[PDB]
Design an enzyme around this catalytic site. Structure first.
Site, PDB file in Angstrom:
ATOM      1  N   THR A 100       0.575  -1.331   0.041  1.00 27.41           N
ATOM      2  CA  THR A 100      -0.064   0.038  -0.134  1.00 27.41           C
ATOM      3  C   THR A 100       0.922   1.381  -0.110  1.00 27.41           C
ATOM      4  O   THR A 100       1.650   1.425   0.999  1.00 27.41           O
ATOM      5  CB  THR A 100      -0.981   0.038   1.081  1.00 27.41           C
ATOM      6  OG1 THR A 100      -1.789  -1.131   1.083  1.00 27.41           O
ATOM      7  CG2 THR A 100      -2.012   1.248   0.984  1.00 27.41           C
ATOM      8  N   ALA A 152      -6.928  -3.868   5.629  1.00 30.54           N
ATOM      9  CA  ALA A 152      -7.781  -3.592   4.587  1.00 30.54           C
ATOM     10  C   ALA A 152      -9.391  -3.708   5.029  1.00 30.54           C
ATOM     11  O   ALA A 152     -10.173  -3.000   4.956  1.00 30.54           O
ATOM     12  CB  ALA A 152      -7.707  -4.795   3.522  1.00 30.54           C
TER      13      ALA A 152
END
Lengths: 247, 245, 195, 241, 252, 212, 232, 204
Positions: F1, F49
Site C-alpha cells: 500500500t 484492509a
C-alpha cells in the site's frame, strides 16, 4: 389518604406508620434499664402464656456483642430478625474496619440505620419494636440507649418502655440518685418491674442481665493478659433469687 | 369509560381506550395535508403561532428523514422528537447494511413498530414506552420498485397506504374536498396548488408563506424544502386561479 | 522519543514540548503542536504512547474546565495536578493501560506564584522546579540545576532552556525538529517563537 | 388525592407532598445560624427533655461534616441521619481527589440535588429536614447557607428554621447590625430561642451551640462545639439565669 | 381519574402532568429575552423578601452553560438545578466528541429531549421548568434565542416573556419591539429588557438583574449601578411623556 | 500500500494504489482504495484492509446522520474525531488502521487528518501511510508547492505513485487519483502502472536504471 | 360484578376473568375471514377493509414461511407481534432441525405464548384472533388460534364480524370440500361463496378479496389485485 | 525487578520508654534516575503516624486513602483514632485487593492515648499485623536496616537518645544503597510534642 403509606405525609407532618409504630411498642411488655456509675442493669419479663411453654426458649435478653446486650418492648417476632441482623452488621461494618467489637455509640447508629431503611422504602413496614441497647466501652464509659421505630436513637440515664410505661416512668424519676452502684440498681430494677404484674413474680419468670465488670471466667481462655472477659453477663435463675431474698 | 387508567386494559367494546384516546390528540395539532401524484408527493402544512414573535420558519413540522423520505407531522412535538429520530436511525442503518434506499412501505412499518410498545414490559417485543405517542406522520418518498407512495403512520401501529390524506383540526373539511378532486392525471403544478386551495379553507387564520410550508420528494430534486420566496410565488398563483373559476 | 521540559521562574512557568511525532520509522509530520490547555492559567504538556496522549489530554481538558465553570473560578494547580494523578492511578489498574506522562505547569492566582509539577505515567505527583520525563530528564536534570539559581528572571530562564536545547541536539540521537515554547504566567498562556 | 404519588403534580400547580414535608419541619425545634464577619454561631434547640434524659454527654443537633463545615439539624433525626452521613462522605471525597477541603457552596449544592431526585424519581419519600450549613472556604470566607426540604438553597446573613419560624425571623432582623460581633451574635441567638421556645428558663441542657472561628492560628479554622457546662456560664452573662 | 398519571392519555388527548407542569412555571420569577443584531439581553427578575438574604454567595437566576451559551430559567429553583447541571455537562461533552463548541440549536433541543424523556415515562414526572437559552453560533454573529417547555417542545422566538404574569409583559413587549427592526445597540437592547421587567417588579432597580451575551464568547453581567442609571433614564423619558400629553391638550 | 495526500490551494489530491498483497501471492491488482465516505469526504485504505473498508463506510453513515440532525454539513474535524473515538474503544483487538480523512469545506478550508487505530489524530498538510510511506514522502516533498496548478497537482500525484510503485514490492496495479473541491470529489480514473510508467520516462527523463 | 375487570390477575365469582372474554370481543370489532381446507390444499379468503376510498386497504395476510402463513381478525398492533414470533419458530426449525415446522406444534407454542402475558401483571391477552394454515408432512391443516389460547383443529371455521353466516355456508357443504383434491381453483370458488354470506352492505371487489393458498407442490402465495380477478 | 524495589524508599521506626521514632528517606526514584530529594514519605492522620515504602503511585494513593478513612473515623467517634485500632485498619485496606494488591509496605508508629504504651507495627504487600515492640523496617535497604538497627538498639531509651539511635541506624544504611538516601527526615513522638528534625547528610 394521609396515614396509609410510608411515602405519604399529612398537613400535620409525619407519616401514619411512625405513629402506629409507636403504638406497637407500648403493646409490648415492660422492659427497663437504669444506668449506674460502674455498670448498667437491663431487665425484662417473660409471659409464658401457658404452663406448657418453657421460659428459657424465649430469649428476650440477647447479647449483640459480648459487651453489648439488648432487650426490646413490642412484638416478639420482629425482635428476632433484627437481633440476627444486628450481630451480622456488628461484625461487618465495624470489626473489619475496627477489628474489635464496636463502641456503644457506633453500633447504636448501625442498628438505627436498619430501622431507618425499614421506614425509607414505600411498601415495607417498619419494625414492631423499639429496643434498649446498653453496652460498654472504654471511651464513652458505661452507657444506655433507646432505638425507637423511626430510625432515631436517644441516650438515656434511665428509661422504660412497653405497657407498664406510665407507672414505671414515674417510679424511675423519683427513685434515681446522682450516684449509685450496680448492685443497688438491681434492686431498684426489680422493684419497678413488679409494678407491672403481682403475684406471678420470681427469678424464673424474670430475665435479668447486666453489662458490668469483666469476668475473665467466661472469657473461655487464659494466660493472655491484654484481652479481657466479657463485660456482658447473664444472671442465672438462682442468682436472681438471691437478690430478691435481699429485698 | 373508566377502564382507561391502565397501560392496556379492556373495555367491554373490546378496544384499547388508551390507544384510541391518543387519536384525538392529533386533532389538537396543526393541520397537515399530503397529496400523492405519480410525479411526486407534495407535503403541505399549517403553522400556528400564538404571537407573531414566534419565528415561524424555525419550528419543524416538515423534516428530512434521509435523502428521499420526508415526513410532515401533526400533534405534539414532544412525542415526535423520539419518533422521528427512530425513523432516521432506521433509514441510515438500512443504507449501512445493504446500500439501498429504504422503501417507503418498510420505513413506515419501522416507525410503527416502536409505536406498538404501550407496556412496561411484555412478551414479544420489550416495551419501555409507558404511553402511546400522540403524533401521526405522513410518510412520503420514492422507491423505484413501487414509485411515489404516500402512507399515513398512526401511533396505533396501523399504517394505511393513501393517495391523499389530511389530519389535525381541518381534517374533516380537507378529506371531503379531496374526495371530489383526486386524479391520477395531476401534474405536479396542479398538485401544489391543490394543496393551497384546500389548506386556506381548513385554516381559521390568514394564509401567508409563514403559515404554510410545502415540500416535495421527487427523485431528481431529492427531498426539497421550499424557500419562502418560492412559497409566496404559489400563493400568488393561488389568487390568480380563483378569479377564472 | 519525545521531549518535555519544564523550568519555573519567579512569575512564570516555561513548558516546552518536541515538534516531532514519529509513528513508525518515519517522522509523521515535522512541525506539530503537542500541548493543550486545561484552564486559562494551567497548561498541560504531554508525551507518551500513541494517541493515548491525545485522548487523555482531551479527557482532562473537559473535566477541569467543568469545575471551573460550576464554581465560577478556575481550579488551582495543586488541585489540577492532583486530579490527573487520580486518573492515572485508576488507569494503571484498569483493563485499558494509559501510558501518558505529563507536566502540569500553571499559575496559582490565589497564592500568586507559579507551580511546576511532574506527574508520572504510573501516577505520582511531586512539585519540582526542573522536571521532565522520558529521556529528556536523562540529560537536563543535571544541566539545569548547575546554571539555575533560586532567583531568576523570565529572560534568563528562556535562555537557559535554549542552552538545554543545544545539549539535547548533540548527545540525544532523536530529532525533535525544534521545540515549541508556551509561557504560562498570570497574564495567560502565550506562544513565543524560539528554536 | 395528589398526596398519592410524589411523581404527580396538583391541578393548582404546586406539589402538596413537598408542602406537607415543609410542615414536617414545624414539629421540630428552632435552629438558628447567624453569620458575622468575625465568625458564625450555629445554635440548635433540643425539642425533647426529661429529668432522666441523658443529654449532657451527647451532641445530636450539631454534627461536624469535615474539619471546616458543620450543620445544625431541624426536623426528623431519622431523615437527618442518612443525609448527614452522605454529605460527610462526599465532602471528604472532594478532599481525597483534589487535595483541598470542600467549598461550602458545592457540598450544599450536591446535597440539595439528591433531595430533588427523591421527589423526581421512584416512589421514595421526600425528606423533611432543613439543615443550616456553616463552613469556611477561602473563596468567599465565612459562608452561611440553609436548605429547604424541596431541595434548594439560599444564602443568608441570619436565618431560622424549625418551629415558629415567622416570629423568630421578625425578632432577628429587628436586632441585626450589619458588622456584628461573634459575641453579640451568640447573645442574639439566646435571646431569640428564649422567646420561641416555651421553656422559659431556657437551660444549658436544653441548648446545643457551636461557634466557628478562625482565631485558632491564621488561615486555620477551629470549629468548637460548646459543651454543656460552658453553655451554662454564658446564660449567666446574658442574665437569663 | 384521569389526571393521576402520565400513563393515562386522558379522554381529550391532554397529558395532565404536562399541563400542571406548565402551571408550575407561573410561580417562578419573570424572565425576558430580547435579541438585537449584535447581542442578546437575557434579563430576569430577581426575588427579594428580606435584606438578610445574600447575593454575594447565592446563585443568580442566570447560569453560564459554557462560555458562549447562557441560560436563564423560570420555575421551581429546586427543580431547575438538576436541569441546569445536565445542560452544562452535555455542552462540555460536545467538545469531547467532536472538538467544536456547542451550537445553540443543539443545546435547546437536548434540554427539551431530557424533559421529553421524563414525560414519556410514567414512573417519573417531568420537571416544571421553562428556560430561555441564549447564545451565538460557533464562528458567526447572528443572535439566537430559544425557548423550551415542560412538554418537551422547543421553539425560536425573537422575543419572549415567561414566568409570573407572562402575558401582561408579553403584550407590551410585542408593541414596542419589532421583528422588522430590532435594537441598534447593545445599550438600547438592555433598556428594553428593563422596561419589560419594571412592570412586573413594581418599584425597583435592585430586583432587576441584567446580563448580556454577545458573539465571540463574550458574556458580561452588568453592574447594579448601571441598572439603577437605566431605571432612572426610563423614569426620565416617562416624565417627558406625561407632560407631552399636557402640552398637546393645551395646543388643540 | 502506498497512499499519500497533500493539500494545495486547488484542493486536496488523494492518491492511492490498487495492489493488495497477501505475502508471495498478489491478492489483487485491481482494488479501490479510496472508500467514498459521502460526496464531500474521501477516506483511504491502508493498514488492515477489512477494518478500513467497514468502519470508513460506517463513518459515512454517521456523516448522513449528523447532517440530518444539525441541518448543516459535517466539519472535517468532527468526522475524524468520531472515527478516532471509535477505534480507541476497541484498541488492541486485531484492529489496525491506516486512513487519511480528507475534506475541503467552505468554513474550515482544506484539511487533512490522519487517523490511526491507536487513537492518534494528527493534523498535517503532507501525510504518507503504508509500507511504501517511506518512498512516498521522497518524491512528494521535493516537487511540492502550496502554489501548484490543478493539472500539475494531478501530475504530481501521478509521478509519486509510480516512483513508489517501482521501488516497492507491494505497490503497483493502477494509479487512482481523486481531487476534492468545495463541491466534492471528481474521480480522475484508473491508469495502469505499466503503460503510464513508460510515458513518464520519456517526458521527465527519470527511471534510468530501467531500460524499458 | 365487575369491579374485577381492571386487573387480569383477578378472577370473578362466576369462575371467569373478564379481560379474556373482552379480548374475545375485540376480534369481532375488526375485519372478517373464513378459513377452509382440503386434504391437499388449505385456503384463507379475507376481506380487506379501507379507511376511506382514497385509502388503499390493509394487508390482512402475513406470509409466515414458505410452508405456513396466517390471517388476522381484530386489532393489528396485536397481530404484528404474534406473527413475528411465529415466523421466528418456522425459521428456527428450518435452520437447526432442517424441517418444515408442523402446524399443530406451532399453533401450540402460540397457545403457550398467550398465557405468558395472561398470568403476569402488565401486558394483556392479545386482542386478535389468528387463522393459521399450512402444509407439512401430515398434509394440510387449518388451526383457529384464540385470545385465550384455545387452539382447535377444524375443517372450516370463520372469525370476525358477522362470521356465523360463513360457518352456516361451511357446515352445509362440509363433506363436499373434503372430497375436492388436486384443484386449488375449486377450493377458492368455495371460499368466495363463503365470504359472501359474512358481508352486509357490501359487494366483492378485486381489492376486497385477498386469497391465500398453500398445498402439496404449491408454496404459500398470496394473491392480490389482478390475481384475484379470475375468481371475482 | 519488583515495582516496589524500582522506585525505592526506606521507612524504619523504633520504640523507647514512652516514645517512638519514625524516620524515612526523602528520595523519589524512577529506576536509576533520581526524581526528587525533598518529597517526604511519612504522613500522619491525627497523632497516629504512618509510613509507606514501595512503588510511588501506591504510596501517594494509600496516603490519600488512609487519610480518607481516618477523617470519617474521627467525626463518627468524636475522637482521634488510636494506633492500636489504626493497625487493624491498615491490614483491612491491604487485604481488600489480594490478586491485584498495592505494592507497598506500611509502618505504623504512635503511642496510645488510652494507656500511653508505645506502639509500632509492620506490614507487607498484602498486609498483616506484624507485631514487635523493638523496631520495624521496610524499603529496598530493608535487609541492611534489619541487622543495623538491632545492633544499635537497646530498650528503655529516652526520647533524645532514641533520636541518636535511629539517626545512625538510617543514615549509614541509606548511604550503602542506591535507591535510598538522598536526604532524610525523622519524627520523634513524645506524647504531646512531636519534634520534626531533618538530617543533614551526604548525597548518594
Amino acid at each position: 389518604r394521609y396515614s396509609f403509606s410510608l411515602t405519604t405525609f399529612s398537613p400535620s407532618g409525619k407519616l401514619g406508620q411512625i405513629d402506629y409504630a409507636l403504638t406497637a411498642v407500648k403493646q409490648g411488655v415492660t422492659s427497663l434499664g437504669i444506668k449506674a456509675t460502674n455498670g448498667v442493669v437491663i431487665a425484662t419479663e417473660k409471659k409464658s402464656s401457658s404452663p406448657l411453654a418453657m421460659s428459657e426458649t424465649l430469649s428476650k435478653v440477647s447479647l449483640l456483642t459480648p459487651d453489648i446486650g439488648a432487650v426490646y418492648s413490642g412484638m416478639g417476632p420482629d425482635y428476632r430478625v433484627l437481633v440476627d441482623k444486628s450481630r451480622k452488621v456488628a461484625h461487618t461494618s465495624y470489626k473489619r474496619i475496627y477489628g474489635e467489637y464496636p463502641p456503644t455509640k457506633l453500633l447504636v447508629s448501625e442498628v438505627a440505620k436498619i430501622m431507618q431503611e425499614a421506614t425509607q422504602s414505600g411498601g415495607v413496614r417498619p419494625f414492631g419494636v423499639s429496643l434498649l441497647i446498653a453496652g460498654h466501652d472504654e471511651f464513652n464509659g458505661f452507657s444506655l440507649y433507646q432505638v425507637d421505630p423511626s430510625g432515631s436513637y436517644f441516650p438515656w440515664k434511665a428509661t422504660a418502655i412497653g405497657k407498664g410505661s406510665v407507672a414505671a416512668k414515674t417510679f424511675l424519676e423519683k427513685r434515681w440518685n446522682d450516684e449509685l452502684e450496680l448492685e443497688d440498681a438491681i434492686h431498684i430494677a426489680l422493684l419497678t418491674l413488679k409494678e407491672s404484674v403481682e403475684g406471678e413474680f420470681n427469678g424464673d419468670t424474670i430475665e435479668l442481665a447486666i453489662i458490668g465488670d469483666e469476668n475473665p471466667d467466661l472469657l473461655g481462655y487464659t494466660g493472655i493478659p491484654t484481652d479481657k472477659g466479657p463485660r456482658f453477663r447473664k444472671l442465672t435463675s438462682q442468682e436472681i433469687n438471691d437478690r430478691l431474698e435481699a429485698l | 369509560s373508566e377502564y382507561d387508567r391502565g397501560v392496556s386494559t379492556f373495555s367491554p367494546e373490546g378496544r384499547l381506550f388508551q390507544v384510541e384516546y391518543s387519536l384525538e390528540a392529533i386533532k389538537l395539532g396543526s393541520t397537515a395535508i399530503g397529496i400523492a401524484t405519480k410525479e411526486g408527493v407534495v407535503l403541505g402544512v399549517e403553522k400556528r403561532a400564538t404571537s407573531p414573535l414566534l419565528e415561524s420558519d424555525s419550528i419543524e413540522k416538515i423534516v428530512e428523514i434521509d435523502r428521499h423520505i420526508g415526513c410532515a407531522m401533526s400533534g405534539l412535538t414532544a412525542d415526535a422528537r423520539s419518533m422521528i429520530e427512530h425513523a432516521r436511525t432506521a433509514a441510515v442503518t438500512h443504507n449501512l447494511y445493504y446500500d439501498e434506499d429504504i422503501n417507503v412501505e418498510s420505513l413506515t412499518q419501522s416507525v410503527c413498530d416502536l409505536a406498538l410498545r404501550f407496556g412496561e414490559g411484555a412478551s414479544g417485543e420489550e416495551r419501555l414506552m409507558s404511553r402511546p405517542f400522540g403524533v401521526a406522520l405522513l410518510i412520503a418518498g420514492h422507491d423505484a420498485d413501487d414509485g411515489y407512495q404516500l402512507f399515513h403512520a398512526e401511533p396505533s401501529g396501523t399504517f394505511y397506504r393513501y393517495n391523499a390524506k389530511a389530519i389535525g383540526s381541518g381534517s374533516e373539511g380537507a378529506q371531503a374536498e379531496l374526495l371530489n378532486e383526486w386524479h391520477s392525471s395531476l401534474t405536479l403544478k396542479e398538485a401544489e396548488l391543490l394543496v393551497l386551495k384546500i389548506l386556506k379553507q381548513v385554516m381559521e387564520e390568514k394564509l401567508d408563506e409563514n403559515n404554510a410550508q410545502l415540500s416535495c420528494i421527487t427523485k431528481q430534486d431529492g427531498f426539497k424544502i421550499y424557500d419562502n420566496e418560492k412559497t409566496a410565488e404559489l400563493i400568488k398563483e393561488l389568487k390568480e386561479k380563483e378569479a377564472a373559476e | 522519543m519525545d521531549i518535555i521540559l519544564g523550568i519555573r521562574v519567579q512569575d512564570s512557568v516555561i513548558l516546552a514540548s518536541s515538534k516531532a511525532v514519529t509513528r513508525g520509522i518515519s517522522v509523521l509530520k515535522d512541525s506539530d503542536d503537542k500541548t493543550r490547555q486545561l484552564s486559562p492559567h494551567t497548561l498541560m504538556s504531554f508525551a507518551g504512547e500513541a494517541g493515548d496522549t491525545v485522548q487523555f489530554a482531551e479527557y482532562i481538558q473537559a473535566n477541569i474546565q467543568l469545575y471551573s465553570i460550576r464554581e465560577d473560578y478556575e481550579l488551582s494547580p495543586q488541585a489540577v495536578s492532583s486530579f490527573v494523578r487520580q486518573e492515572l492511578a485508576k488507569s494503571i489498574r484498569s483493563r485499558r493501560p494509559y501510558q501518558v506522562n505529563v507536566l502540569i505547569g500553571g499559575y496559582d492566582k490565589k497564592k500568586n506564584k507559579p507551580e511546576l509539577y511532574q506527574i508520572d505515567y504510573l501516577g505520582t505527583k511531586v512539585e519540582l522546579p526542573y522536571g521532565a520525563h522520558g529521556y529528556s530528564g536523562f540529560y537536563t536534570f543535571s544541566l539545569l540545576d548547575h546554571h539555575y539559581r533560586p532567583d531568576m528572571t523570565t529572560e534568563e530562564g528562556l535562555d537557559l532552556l535554549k542552552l538545554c536545547v543545544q545539549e539535547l541536539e548533540k548527545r540525544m540521537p532523536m530529532d525533535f525538529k525544534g521545540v515549541i515554547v508556551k509561557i504560562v504566567d498570570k497574564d495567560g498562556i502565550r506562544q513565543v517563537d524560539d528554536f | 388525592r395528589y398526596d398519592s404519588r410524589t411523581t404527580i403534580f396538583s391541578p393548582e400547580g404546586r406539589l402538596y407532598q413537598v408542602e406537607y414535608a415543609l410542615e414536617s419541619i414545624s414539629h421540630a425545634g428552632t435552629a438558628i445560624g447567624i453569620m458575622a464577619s468575625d465568625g458564625i454561631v450555629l445554635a440548635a434547640e433540643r425539642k425533647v427533655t426529661s429529668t432522666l434524659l441523658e443529654q449532657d454527654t451527647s451532641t445530636e443537633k450539631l454534627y461536624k461534616l469535615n474539619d471546616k463545615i458543620a450543620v445544625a439539624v431541624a426536623g426528623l433525626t431519622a431523615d437527618a441521619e442518612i443525609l448527614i452521613n452522605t454529605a460527610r462522605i462526599h465532602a471528604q471525597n472532594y478532599l481525597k481527589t483534589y487535595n483541598e477541603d470542600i467549598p461550602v457552596e458545592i457540598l450544599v449544592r450536591r446535597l440539595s440535588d439528591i433531595k430533588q431526585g427523591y421527589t423526581q424519581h421512584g416512589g421514595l419519600r421526600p425528606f423533611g429536614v432543613s439543615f443550616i450549613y456553616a463552613g469556611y472556604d477561602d473563596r468567599y470566607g465565612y459562608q452561611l447557607y440553609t436548605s429547604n426540604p424541596s431541595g434548594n438553597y439560599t444564602g443568608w446573613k441570619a436565618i431560622s428554621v424549625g418551629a415558629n419560624t415567622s416570629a423568630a425571623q421578625t425578632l432577628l432582623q429587628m436586632d441585626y447590625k450589619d458588622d456584628m460581633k461573634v459575641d453579640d451574635a451568640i447573645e442574639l441567638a439566646l435571646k431569640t430561642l428564649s422567646k420561641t421556645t416555651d421553656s422559659s428558663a431556657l437551660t444549658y441542657d436544653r441548648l446545643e451551640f457551636a461557634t466557628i472561628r478562625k482565631g485558632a492560628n491564621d488561615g486555620e479554622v477551629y470549629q468548637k462545639i460548646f459543651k454543656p457546662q460552658e453553655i451554662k456560664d454564658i446564660l449567666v452573662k446574658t442574665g437569663i439565669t | 381519574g384521569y389526571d393521576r398519571a402520565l400513563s393515562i392519555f386522558s379522554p381529550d388527548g391532554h397529558i395532565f402532568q404536562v399541563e400542571y407542569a406548565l402551571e408550575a412555571v407561573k410561580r417562578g420569577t419573570c424572565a425576558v429575552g430580547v435579541k438585537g443584531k449584535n447581542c442578546v439581553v437575557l434579563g430576569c427578575e430577581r426575588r427579594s423578601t428580606l435584606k438578610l438574604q445574600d447575593t454575594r454567595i447565592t446563585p443568580s437566576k442566570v447560569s453560564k452553560i459554557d462560555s458562549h451559551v447562557v441560560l436563564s430559567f423560570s420555575g421551581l429553583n429546586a427543580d431547575s438545578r438538576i436541569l441546569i447541571e445536565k445542560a452544562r455537562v452535555e455542552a462540555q461533552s460536545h467538545r469531547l466528541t467532536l472538538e467544536d463548541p456547542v451550537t445553540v440549536e443543539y443545546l435547546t433541543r437536548y434540554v427539551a429531549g431530557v424533559q421529553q424523556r421524563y414525560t414519556q415515562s410514567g414512573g417519573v414526572r417531568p420537571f416544571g421548568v421553562s428556560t430561555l437559552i441564549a447564545g451565538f453560533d460557533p464562528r458567526d454573529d447572528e443572535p439566537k434565542l430559544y425557548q423550551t417547555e415542560p412538554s418537551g417542545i422547543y421553539s425560536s422566538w425573537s422575543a419572549q416573556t415567561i414566568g409570573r404574569n407572562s402575558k401582561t409583559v408579553r403584550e407590551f413587549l410585542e408593541k414596542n419591539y419589532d421583528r422588522k427592526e430590532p435594537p441598534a445597540t447593545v445599550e438600547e437592547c438592555v433598556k428594553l429588557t428593563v422596561r419589560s421587567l419594571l412592570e412586573v417588579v413594581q418599584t425597583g432597580a435592585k430586583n432587576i438583574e441584567i446580563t448580556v451575551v454577545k458573539p465571540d464568547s463574550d458574556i458580561v453581567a452588568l453592574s447594579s449601578e448601571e441598572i439603577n442609571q437605566y431605571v432612572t433614564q426610563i423614569e426620565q423619558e416617562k416624565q417627558e411623556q406625561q407632560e407631552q400629553d399636557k402640552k398637546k391638550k393645551s395646543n388643540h | 500500500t502506498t497512499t499519500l495526500a497533500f493539500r494545495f490551494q486547488g484542493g486536496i489530491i488523494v492518491a492511492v494504489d490498487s495492489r493488495a498483497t497477501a505475502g508471495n501471492w498478489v491478492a489483487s491488482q485491481t482494488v479501490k482504495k479510496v472508500i467514498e465516505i459521502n460526496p464531500f469526504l474521501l477516506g483511504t485504505m491502508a493498514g488492515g484492509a477489512a477494518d478500513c473498508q467497514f468502519w470508513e463506510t460506517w463513518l459515512g453513515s454517521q456523516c448522513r446522520l449528523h447532517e440530518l440532525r444539525e441541518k448543516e454539513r459535517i466539519s472535517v474535524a468532527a468526522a475524524s474525531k468520531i472515527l478516532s473515538n471509535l477505534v480507541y474503544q476497541y484498541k488492541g483487538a486485531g484492529l489496525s488502521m491506516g486512513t487519511m480523512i480528507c475534506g475541503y469545506t467552505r468554513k474550515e478550508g482544506p484539511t487533512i487528518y490522519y487517523v490511526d487505530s491507536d487513537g492518534t489524530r494528527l493534523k498535517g498538510d503532507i501525510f504518507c501511510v503504508g509500507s511504501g510511506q517511506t518512498f512516498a514522502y521522497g518524491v512528494l516533498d521535493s516537487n511540492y508547492k502550496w502554489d501548484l496548478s490543478v493539472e500539475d497537482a494531478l501530475y504530481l500525484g501521478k509521478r509519486s505513485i509510480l516512483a513508489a510503485a517501482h521501488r516497492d514490492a507491494y505497490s503497483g496495479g493502477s494509479v487512482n487519483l481523486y481531487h476534492v473541491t468545495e463541491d466534492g470529489w471528481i474521480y480522475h480514473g484508473n491508469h495502469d502502472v505499466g503503460e503510464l510508467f513508460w510515458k513518464v520516462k520519456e517526458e521527465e527523463g527519470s527511471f534510468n536504471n530501467v531500460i524499458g | 360484578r365487575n369491579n374485577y375487570d381492571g386487573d387480569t390477575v383477578t378472577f370473578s365469582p362466576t369462575g371467569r376473568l373478564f379481560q379474556v372474554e373482552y379480548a374475545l370481543e375485540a376480534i369481532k370489532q375488526g375485519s372478517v375471514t373464513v378459513g377452509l381446507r382440503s386434504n391437499t390444499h388449505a385456503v384463507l379468503v379475507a376481506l380487506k377493509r379501507n379507511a376511506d376510498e382514497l385509502s388503499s386497504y390493509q394487508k390482512k395476510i402475513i406470509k409466515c414461511d414458505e410452508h405456513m402463513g396466517l390471517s388476522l381478525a381484530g386489532l393489528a398492533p396485536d397481530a404484528r407481534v404474534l406473527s413475528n414470533y411465529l415466523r421466528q419458530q418456522c425459521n428456527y426449525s428450518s435452520l437447526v432441525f432442517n424441517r418444515k415446522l408442523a402446524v399443530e406444534r406451532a399453533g401450540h407454542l402460540l397457545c403457550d405464548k398467550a398465557q405468558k402475558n395472561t398470568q403476569s401483571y402488565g401486558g394483556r391477552p392479545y386482542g386478535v384472533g389468528l387463522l393459521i394454515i399450512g402444509y407439512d408432512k401430515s398434509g394440510a391443516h387449518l388451526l383457529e388460534f384464540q385470545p385465550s389460547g384455545n387452539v382447535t383443529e377444524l375443517y372450516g371455521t370463520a372469525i370476525g364480524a358477522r362470521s356465523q353466516g360463513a360457518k352456516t355456508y361451511l357446515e352445509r357443504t362440509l363433506d363436499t370440500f373434503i372430497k375436492i383434491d388436486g384443484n386449488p381453483d375449486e377450493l377458492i370458488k368455495a371460499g368466495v361463496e363463503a365470504i359472501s354470506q359474512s358481508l352486509r352492505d357490501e359487494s366483492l371487489t378485486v381489492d376486497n378479496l385477498s386469497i391465500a393458498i398453500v398445498g402439496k407442490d404449491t408454496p404459500f402465495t398470496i394473491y392480490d389485485g389482478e390475481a384475484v380477478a379470475k375468481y371475482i | 525487578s519488583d515495582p516496589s524495589s524500582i522506585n525505592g524508599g526506606i521507612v524504619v521506626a523504633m520504640t523507647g520508654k514512652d516514645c517512638v521514632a519514625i524516620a524515612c528517606d526523602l528520595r523519589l526514584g524512577s529506576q536509576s534516575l533520581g526524581v526528587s530529594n525533598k518529597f517526604e514519605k511519612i504522613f500522619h492522620y491525627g497523632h497516629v503516624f504512618l509510613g509507606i515504602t514501595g512503588l510511588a503511585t501506591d504510596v501517594t494513593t494509600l496516603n490519600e486513602m488512609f487519610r480518607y478513612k481516618t477523617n470519617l473515623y474521627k467525626l463518627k467517634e468524636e475522637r482521634a483514632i488510636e494506633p492500636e485500632t489504626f493497625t487493624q485498619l491498615v491490614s483491612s485496606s491491604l487485604y481488600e485487593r489480594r490478586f491485584g494488591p498495592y505494592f507497598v509496605g506500611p509502618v505504623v508508629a504512635g503511642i496510645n492515648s488510652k494507656s500511653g504504651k508505645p506502639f509500632i507495627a509492620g506490614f507487607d504487600l498484602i498486609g498483616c499485623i506484624d507485631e514487635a515492640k523493638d523496631f520495624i523496617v521496610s524499603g529496598t535497604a530493608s535487609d541492611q536496616l534489619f541487622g543495623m538497627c538491632e545492633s544499635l538498639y537497646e530498650p528503655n531509651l529516652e526520647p533524645e537518645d532514641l533520636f541518636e539511635t535511629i539517626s545512625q541506624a538510617l543514615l549509614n544504611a541509606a548511604d550503602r544503597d542506591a535507591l535510598s538516601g538522598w536526604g532524610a527526615v525523622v519524627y520523634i513522638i513524645k506524647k504531646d510534642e512531636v519534634v520534626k528534625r531533618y538530617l543533614k547528610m551526604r548525597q548518594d
